[PDB]
Structures are given as structure tokens and as C-alpha cells.
Amino acid sequence: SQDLSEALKEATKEVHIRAENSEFMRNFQKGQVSREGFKLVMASLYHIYTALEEEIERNKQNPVYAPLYFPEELHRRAALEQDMAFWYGPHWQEAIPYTPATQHYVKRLHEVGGTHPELLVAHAYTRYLGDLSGGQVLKKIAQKAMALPSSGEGLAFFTFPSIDNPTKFKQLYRARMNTLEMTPEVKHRVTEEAKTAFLLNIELFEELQALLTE
Ligand code: HEM
Numbered sequence: 001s002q003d004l005s006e007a008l009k010e011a012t013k014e015v016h017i018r019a020e021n022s023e024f025m026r027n028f029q030k031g032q033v034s035r036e037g038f039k040l041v042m043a044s045l046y047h048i049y050t051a052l053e054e055e056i057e058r059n060k061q062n063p064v065y066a067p068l069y070f071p072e073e074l075h076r077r078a079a080l081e082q083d084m085a086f087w088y089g090p091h092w093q094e095a096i097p098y099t100p101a102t103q104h105y106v107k108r109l110h111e112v113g114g115t116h117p118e119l120l121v122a123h124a125y126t127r128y129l130g131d132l133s134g135g136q137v138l139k140k141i142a143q144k145a146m147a148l149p150s151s152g153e154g155l156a157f158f159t160f161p162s163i164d165n166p167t168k169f170k171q172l173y174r175a176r177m178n179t180l181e182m183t184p185e186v187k188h189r190v191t192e193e194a195k196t197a198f199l200l201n202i203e204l205f206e207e208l209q210a211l212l213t214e
Contacts, residue, residue: 004187005174008125011191015198020134024205028138031145037212038146039087042157043096044105044204046084049076051106052127055113055120064118067176073163074128079156086154101207105200112193118186119193121177126197129173131158132166 001007019025024041027033053075059065084092112119139158148154163169182190 003174003178004121004180004182004190005177007187007191008122008177008194012126012194012198015195015202019198019202019205022202022205022209024209027209028141031141033142033145034212035146037208038142040097040099040208040211042080042083042087044099044102044208045076045157046080046096047098047102047106048109049080049127051109051113052123053077055109055117056124058113059117059120062117064180064182065120065124067179068121068124068173070128070173073160073169074131076131076157079159082156083154099204099207099211101200101204105204108196108200116193118182119190121180122190122193123197125177126194126201129170132160132163132170136166 001010020029024033024037056065056069056071056075060069060071081092084096088095109123112123135158139155142148142155142158146154152159160166
């Protein structure tokens with residue numbers, strides 16, 4: 001569409017359906033993910049968010065991103081570290097895996113953050129909006145399936161204490177996106193990078209799904 005928010009939604013409509021229909025997400029949605037499979041994805045998201053947020057800090061003041069700087073409400077690294085401590089123990093740092101797909105995803109994040117900051121928004125959009133949408137639905141499935149403490153330990157990643165109304169917040173995040181100044185050509189590259197983002201996620205779920213059945 002015209003506004004970035006709508007252009008992104010329109011451009012990723014297909015890959016999104018493909019992402020939720022991946023073998024791994026379907027099993028997860030039916031409550032058939034194992035503790036080992038869950039530990040794997042969370043370990044992968046750790047590296048992913050560590051890189052993403054690393055690049056966000058680098059570009060937090062660049063106008064091509066700045067309007068979307070939400071460290072207190074969205075950043076996931078700290079939450080993910082609490083989850084690693086929970087699922088892997090005090091030495092999770094040297095214990096967590098780092099799959100090829102994960103490095104490949106991380107690799108793209110650092111290129112974007114380093115040489116194409118004007119595209120970072122596509123990666124933030126893909127991850128954070130999903131976390132406040134389907135991530136919230138998956139959080140409840142994980143709760144019944146894994147049987148974790150009602151205290152929230154092990155699922156800090158799915159919890160956003162500063163966002164009491166995710167629907168409202170997503171609206172504000174979209175409004176901020178439509179505030180970004182960029183030529184029509186950069187906007188197209190941004191929607192395209194968003195596709196890649198989903199793809200990176202899709203191929204990750206394919207890799208992880210293959211590691212489990214293995
Ligand atoms: C587990 C399966 C999933 C389900 C059931 C699901 C469900 C949804 C729903 C219902 C919305 C619309 C919320 C709204 O209108 O504000 C949404 C939006 C979104 N989802 Fe998913 N999702 C899933 C997986 C994913 C994955 C794996 C990603 C990314 C890697 C993702 C990324 C997004 C994004 C970026 C949006 C925002 C779209 C926009 O408003 O422009 N989702 N999702």
C-alpha cells in the first residue's frame with residue numbers, strides 16, 4: 001500500500017501464512033513441541049535478538065530508525081538471558097547451541113545494521129510485531145504443554161511488562177513506521193527485506209524441525 005505499515009502488511013501476507021504453517025509452528029500450535037525443541041528455538045532467538053538489539057543500539061539515533069526505538073517496552077535480550085539461565089543453567093553461555101540457520105540470520109542482521117541501517121525497521125517489524133501477536137498465542141500453548149511455574153520463569157521472552165495493551169501498542173508502532181522518511185524506492189527495499197526476514201525465520205523453523213525429527 002502507501003503507508004509503510006500497510007505496504008509491509010501487504011508484502012508479507014504470504015510469507016506470514018507460510019511461516020505459521022511451517023511444520024514446526026503447526027506442531028507448536030497443536031501443543032506438540034517438546035522441551036528439547038522449545039529449548040532449541042529459544043536458544044536461537046537469544047542469538048537473533050542479541051544481534052538485532054545490538055544493531056538497534058548502534059542505530060538508535062539514526063533518523064532511518066530512531067522513531068522505532070523502544071528499549072524499555074520491546075527489547076528481549078535480558079528476558080532471553082533469564083530464560084537461558086532457566087533452561088540451560090548458570091553456564092548457558094557455553095552450553096546453548098548456535099545452529100547454521102541462526103548464524104545466517106544473525107549474519108544478515110549485522111550486514112543490515114552495519115551497511116543498510118535504513119532496512120533495520122523491516123527486521124524489527126518482523127520480530128517484535130509477531131511477538132505481540134502470534135507470540136502471545138504461543139505463550140499460552142507453551143504454558144499448558146511445558147507446565148512451567150505460574151510465576152513466569154522460562155517464558156520471560158513472551159512477557160512484556162511495559163505493554164499492558166499489545167493491540168494499542170502495535171497501532172502506535174505502525175504510526176511511528178509511517179513517520180520514517182524514505183524515497184519510494186527505499187520503501188520497496190524495506191518491504192522486500194521484510195520478506196527476507198520472514199524467510200530467515202521460515203528456514204530456521206525448517207532447520208530446527210529437521211534437527212528434532214533427526
Ligand atoms: C505461530 C503462528 C502464528 C500465528 C497464529 C500468528 C498470528 C498473527 C495474527 C493473528 C496477527 C494479526 C495481529 C494484528 O492485526 O495486530 C499477526 C501479525 C503479525 N505476525 Fe504472526 N502469527 C504467527 C507467527 C508469526 C511468525 C513466525 C512471524 C515472524 C517471523 C510473525 C510475524 C507477524 C508480524 C510481523 C505481524 C504484524 C502484521 C502487521 O500488522 O503488519 N507471525 N500474527
